[PDB]
A paper describes a structure:
Cables formed by head-to-tail polymerization of tropomyosin, localized along the length of sarcomeric and cytoskeletal actin filaments, play a key role in regulating a wide range of motile and contractile processes. Here, we present high–resolution structures of cables formed by acetylated and unacetylated Schizosaccharomyces pombe tropomyosin ortholog TpmCdc8. All homodimer conformers are approximately 230 Å in length and exhibit head–to–tail interactions, where the N–termini of one homodimer contact the C–termini of an adjacent homodimer. Each of the conformers that make up the TpmCdc8 cables consists of two α-helices that are wrapped around each other, forming a left-handed coiled–coil structure.
Native, unacetylated TpmCdc8 yielded crystals in space group P1 with one homodimer in the asymmetric unit and a diffraction limit of 2.2 Å (conf-U1). Conf-U1 and conf-U2 have a straight coiled–coil structure, whereas conf-U3 contains a central 24° kink. In our case, the structure of an isolated TpmCdc8 dimer was predicted accurately by AlphaFold 3 (57) with a rmsd of only 1.56 Å when compared with conf-U1. In contrast, the electron density for the N-terminal methionine residues in conf–U1 is not well defined, indicating greater flexibility within the N-termini. In conf–U1, the majority of the interactions stabilizing the overlap junction are of hydrophobic nature. In addition, residues K7 and E159 form a salt bridge. Residue R12 of conf-U1 also interacts with the C-terminal part of the next coiled-coil, but here residue R12 interacts with the C-terminus and the side chain of D160. The overlap length for the acetylated conf–A1 is reduced (5.8 Å) compared to conf-U1 (9.3 Å), which is also reflected in different buried areas of conf-U1 (1531.1 Å2) and conf–A1 (1279.0 Å2). The interaction energies of the conformers are −50.5 kcal/mol for conf-A1, −27.2 kcal/mol for conf-U1, −55.0 kcal/mol for conf-U2 and −40.3 kcal/mol for conf-U3.
Author numbering:
A (entry chain A), B (entry chain B), C (entry chain B), D (entry chain A): 1 to 161
Write the structure that this text describes.
């Protein structure tokens, strides 16, 4: 009849609509499942890359601390070398001054030694001359005493006549 | 009745099967959509983290290079500092030796000056004594000559008797 | 005297004889005349009687002839009467037979009329019942056709499921 | 003498007169005697004739009475025959009328029989048709009940769907 055929058409329409819904939903489900699996694989790859990167970061931080210590030591040594160069210059100036002073003092000592030697040679010559003239004076005094006594005796002799 | 009831049963079963499959597919599609959204969010967060890690890696690598620049020169700088320190110690030893030599030279100069003053005073005394001896010798010689001449004149006069 | 007396005696005797004979003859003549007269009278009377007898004889003879005319026909007339009486009795018997046949025919006609009325009433009742059955059969056939068509339409619609 | 002769003449005259009387009387007597004898013979003949005539009269009277009886019987029979002829005519008329009536009644009975036979044949045909349609109505009623129950069951089945 009319109503029975209409109900049958409605039943077939409901069934076909459900089948179309199922087909579309299954297609979209397949697509999203493939997308989810691919995104999980990408996340795993990126996580392994991040682990490697963090390991490299730790290693680089350790190396950086070591190099910081060594570079600070190098800078300390460089400052020390600069100050030692300046100190070398100062000490060389002081040594030049003191060496000039030492040479001047040595020359003055040599001059004083020459003066002392001159005076000592004068002493020796004066002593020689003094001894010689002292002996000569003794001789002449004896001779004069003798001849004066003789002359007085001769005068006393000629006085009586 | 007969195959009419069989037909309505089979049609109802097919319709219910289609509806159930559609509902299950739609529910699973919603679930996988939600899971994919969450996975995308966490993957984006991990990507941001990995980018930050890479930036830190590059910064640390550049710092490591800049620090190696001085860390490699640490030892050569230490050698240069040791050379300059040895030069400084040599200059200091030379200064101390010069100080000692200057002290010794000054001491010897003072001693020689005292010796020269002593010898000069001795020269003065000896010159005074020598002049005194010479004057006395001249006087004694003159007196001896006078007395001898008088005696000889007397003796000569006696011959003409 | 003598022969005179004889003569007178003889003459007287002859005369007396003649007279006596004459008287006797006359007396006998008178007697025979009277007898003849009486005989004539009685003969005339007898003649009258005989004439009357002859007249009566002729009358009776004529009457006898006239009566014989019918007396001879008596027997033939009786035969004719018997024939007519037999015809009458035959007609009477035919009338009685016709009366009996008419009674029987009327009785049978009444019986047949009653039979015909009975059959006519039976025809009326049977026609009423037949029309009732026909109407009911038409109605039942129409309703069966309607229900069968509806069932077939339903079953046809079920095939297109 | 004169007187004697006169007496003799008178005697002879008397004798002759007596003789003449006797002769005449005897002649007349003979005649009348012959007449009387002849009349007696005639009377005897006529008397015998009269006796014969009276005998014939008696015989004729007896015959006449017999013929009277027979002729009266003949006349009675003739009247009877005439009346029987009239009665024959009357009875023939009555028989003709009654025979016409009998034939009319027989024809009416035949017509009534034809009518009754017509009605009886109608009865038989109507009974045949009634039985046929009654069986057909039973069949159709059963079929309609069955198909109506089936249709109601199908409606109840499709109602639940």
């Amino acid at each position: 009849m009319d109503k029975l055929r209409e109900k049958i058409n409605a039943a077939r329409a409901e069934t076909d609509e459900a089948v179309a819904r199922a087909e579309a939903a299954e297609a979209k489900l397949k697509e999203v499942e493939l997308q989810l699996s691919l995104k999980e694989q990408e996340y795993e790859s990126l996580s392994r890359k991040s682990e490697a990167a963090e390991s490299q970061l730790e290693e680089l931080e350790e190396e950086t601390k070591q190099l910081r210590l060594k570079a600070d030591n190098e800078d300390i040594q460089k400052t020390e070398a600069e100050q030692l160069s300046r100190k070398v210059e100062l000490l060389e100036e002081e040594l030049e001054t003191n060496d000039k002073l030492l040479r001047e003092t040595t020359e003055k000592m040599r001059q004083t030694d020459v003066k002392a030697e001159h005076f000592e040679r004068r002493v020796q010559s004066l002593e020689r001359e003094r001894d010689d003239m002292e002996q000569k004076l003794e001789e002449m005094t004896d001779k004069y005493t003798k001849v004066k006594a003789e002359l007085d005796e001769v005068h006393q002799a000629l006085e009586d006549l």
